C-alpha cells in the first residue's frame, strides 16, 4: 500500500532541529497536532537536545510519564508532541516557565519567562469562519478555534489568549506601526515595525519591515506574527531581541571577549 | 479505470507502467428503473456511503413558480436527452423527463390558495390543462445513482414548450 509515512530520516528532518548526522538513522516524527511539523519541534528534542534534561528517548519518556511538563498549562504526555511557534511550557518539578520563540538565526529556543507572563500567550488568527447562527470563530496559528471573537478582529490580526480560561484579552492589528516577528523566511526571527504593505492581486502579498537599526527587509505576508504596537512587544524576547547582525560584524563582537 | 490507456493529445500511444490503482476505481453504472423502492449501499473512499438506487416509484417534486416541494409518485418516464434507450427501458437519470401524479399539487393549491408568502402567481394554462388531466410533466434534478432517491421539479414555460414539442411538424 501507499498510506501515510511514519518515519523521519535524520538528514530529512528540519534543519533547525539541529540533529547531528551520525546520531542514528531516524528522527522523531512529530505527532499531528497544533502545529505543522516544519514550524515546530517535538518536545522530545525540546528537553533532550535543548534543555539536556534527558539523554535518551527513554529518558524523555521517563520525564513525560509523570504529569510534570505542561504545554499551554495543560499536561502533555506524547513523546513527539509538536510544541509550536510560540507558547508556554511549564515544568512543575523544577518550577520553570519557557516560551518557545525564534532566535535571529531561525531556530527554536525556550526563553525563560516569569510566572506572571506564562499566562499570556499570543495567537495569530489565520481564518475567520462564521457558522450557524452568525457565530464567528477565529482559527489561529496554534490550530486553535476561538468562538465569539470581537468583530473588529481581522484575518491577519493577533489576539492575546489567557491559558487558564481560553479567552481573548485584547487584540492587535497590522498597521504600519505594529511590530512583528518573522517566522519562516530568510529573515526568520527578526523583529521589526512593518514599513509598508504591498498587496498584489492574486499572488503573495509582500510586506517591508523596518528593523530597530533602520534596516529594511521584505517578507511574505503569511510569514509574520504581530507581537505588539509601536510602544513595545507584548511578550518578552530572547537576548538578541530579534536584532540580526551582519556576519562581518558578528565576528568582531565574538572576538572581543 | 480512469486517467491512462488513452492516446496523447498528439495521437501518440503512451507506454503504460504503474498498474491500476484503487483510487481510480470506476464502479459499474446503476440503471435505475422505476419500481418498488430498493437501494443498495456503496462504500466509497473514506468510508463515505453512496446510496445506489435500483428502483424508485416516488420522490420529492417541486413546483418552482411557488417554490413548494411535495412528495408524489412517478408514473412514467417519457424523454431523456441522452440515449433514447433510457426512456424505452424506463431508467431514471438526472435530467430525465417523467410524468408524475399532480393530485398532491392540486390539493395543496386548493387548500392554501382556495379555489381550484409571495402568493397570487396567476399560474399558466398549459400546466393547468395537464393538472386537469391529472398527470404532469417533470424533470428529475437529483442523481438516483448517487443520492439514492429520484427527485425533481415540474417543468413550465418555455422549457415545457420545448420538451412538449420535442416529444410530440411532429409525430
Amino acid at each position: 500500500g501507499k498510506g501515510i509515512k511514519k518515519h523521519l530520516k535524520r538528514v530529512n528532518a528540519p534543519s533547525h532541529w539541529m540533529l547531528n548526522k551520525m546520531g542514528g538513522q531516524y528522527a522523531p516524527k512529530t505527532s499531528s497536532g497544533p502545529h505543522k511539523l516544519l514550524e515546530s519541534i517535538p518536545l522530545v528534542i525540546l528537553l533532550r537536545n535543548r534543555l539536556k534534561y534527558a539523554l535518551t528517548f527513554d529518558e524523555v519518556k521517563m520525564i513525560l510519564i509523570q504529569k510534570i511538563v505542561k504545554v499551554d498549562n495543560k499536561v502533555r504526555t506524547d513523546c513527539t508532541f509538536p510544541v509550536g511557534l510560540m507558547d508556554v511550557i511549564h515544568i512543575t518539578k523544577s518550577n520553570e516557565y519557557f516560551r518557545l520563540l525564534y532566535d535571529i538565526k531561525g531556530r527554536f529556543v525556550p526563553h525563560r519567562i516569569t510566572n506572571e507572563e506564562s499566562k499570556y500567550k499570543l495567537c495569530k488568527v489565520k481564518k475567520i469562519l462564521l457558522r450557524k447562527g452568525r457565530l464567528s470563530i477565529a482559527v489561529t496559528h496554534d490550530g486553535r478555534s476561538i468562538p465569539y471573537i470581537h468583530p473588529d478582529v481581522k484575518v491577519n490580526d493577533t489576539v492575546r489568549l489567557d491559558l487558564e480560561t481560553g479567552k481573548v484579552l485584547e487584540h492587535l492589528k497590522f498597521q504600519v506601526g505594529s511590530l512583528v516577528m518573522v517566522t519562516a523566511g530568510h529573515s526568520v526571527g527578526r523583529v521589526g515595525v512593518i514599513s509598508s504593505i504591498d498587496k498584489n492581486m492574486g499572488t503573495y502579498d509582500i510586506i517591508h519591515v523596518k528593523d530597530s537599526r533602520n534596516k529594511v527587509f521584505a517578507t511574505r505576508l503569511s510569514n509574520v506574527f504581530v507581537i505588539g504596537d509601536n510602544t513595545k512587544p507584548y511578550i518578552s524576547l530572547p537576548r538578541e531581541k530579534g536584532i540580526k547582525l551582519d556576519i562581518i560584524e558578528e565576528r568582531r563582537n565574538r572576538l572581543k571577549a | 479505470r480512469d486517467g491512462r490507456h488513452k492516446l496523447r493529445l498528439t495521437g501518440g500511444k503512451k507506454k503504460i507502467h504503474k498498474k491500476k490503482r484503487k483510487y481510480e476505481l470506476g464502479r459499474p453504472p446503476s440503471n435505475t428503473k422505476l419500481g418498488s423502492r430498493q437501494v443498495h449501499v456503496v462504500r466509497g473512499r473514506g468510508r463515505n456511503y453512496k446510496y445506489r438506487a435500483i428502483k424508485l416509484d416516488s420522490g420529492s417534486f417541486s413546483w418552482p413558480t411557488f417554490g413548494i416541494s411535495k412528495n408524489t409518485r412517478i408514473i412514467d418516464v417519457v424523454y431523456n436527452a441522452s440515449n433514447n434507450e433510457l426512456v424505452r427501458t424506463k431508467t431514471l437519470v438526472k435530467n430525465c423527463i417523467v410524468v408524475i401524479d399532480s393530485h398532491p399539487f392540486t390539493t395543496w393549491y386548493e387548500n392554501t390558495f382556495g379555489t381550484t408568502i409571495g402568493k397570487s402567481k396567476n399560474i399558466d394554462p398549459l400546466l393547468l390543462e395537464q393538472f386537469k388531466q391529472g398527470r404532469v410533466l417533470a424533470c428529475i434534478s437529483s442523481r438516483p445513482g448517487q443520492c439514492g432517491k429520484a427527485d425533481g421539479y415540474i417543468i413550465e414555460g418555455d422549457e415545457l414548450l420545448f420538451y412538449k414539442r420535442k416529444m410530440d411538424k411532429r409525430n
Binding site: 548526522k21 551520525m22 556576519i247 562581518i248 565576528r251 | -
Partner: protein, 125 residues
C-alpha cells in the same frame, strides 16, 4: 545504509612524473626538512594551493565588498595564527606569496629541531 561522514584526499599527484628539476627540488626539500616521503610535500603544496586559490578568488573581488571583507580577514587571521605571516604583513598579496618552505617551517619536527631538544631533524622525527 552508507555512513554519513565525509572523507577527502589531501595530496595530488604531480603529473609529468620525471621532471629532473622538479625531482631535484623535491629531494632538496625532503632532505633538508627530514620528512619521510614526497607524498608529504605533495600534501603541503596541496594545502598551499588551497590557500592560494582562496586568496586569488578574494583578490578578484573588489575592495569593501562583503564577501571580501569577511573571508579575507578570516583567512588572514588563520594564517597569522598558523604563523605563516608576520606583523609587517597586512594584505592578501603576501598570503598569495607565501611559499612551500615557509609552510614546512611549522611542522613539529622542524620546530623542535629549531628549539633544540633533538640535534638532527631526523632525530626530531
Amino acid at each position: 545504509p552508507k555512513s554519513y561522514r565525509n572523507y577527502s584526499k589531501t595530496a595530488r599527484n604531480p603529473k609529468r612524473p620525471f621532471e629532473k628539476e622538479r625531482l631535484d627540488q623535491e629531494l632538496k626539500l625532503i632532505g633538508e626538512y627530514g620528512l619521510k616521503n614526497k607524498r608529504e610535500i605533495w600534501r603541503v603544496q596541496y594545502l598551499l594551493a588551497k590557500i592560494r586559490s582562496a586568496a586569488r578568488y578574494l583578490l578578484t573581488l573588489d575592495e569593501k565588498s562583503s564577501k571580501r571583507i569577511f573571508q579575507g580577514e578570516a583567512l588572514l587571521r588563520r594564517m597569522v595564527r598558523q604563523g605563516l605571516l608576520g606583523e609587517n604583513e597586512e594584505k592578501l598579496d603576501y598570503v598569495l606569496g607565501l611559499t612551500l618552505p615557509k609552510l614546512l617551517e611549522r611542522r613539529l619536527q622542524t620546530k623542535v629541531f629549531k628549539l633544540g631538544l633533538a640535534k638532527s631533524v631526523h632525530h626530531a622525527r
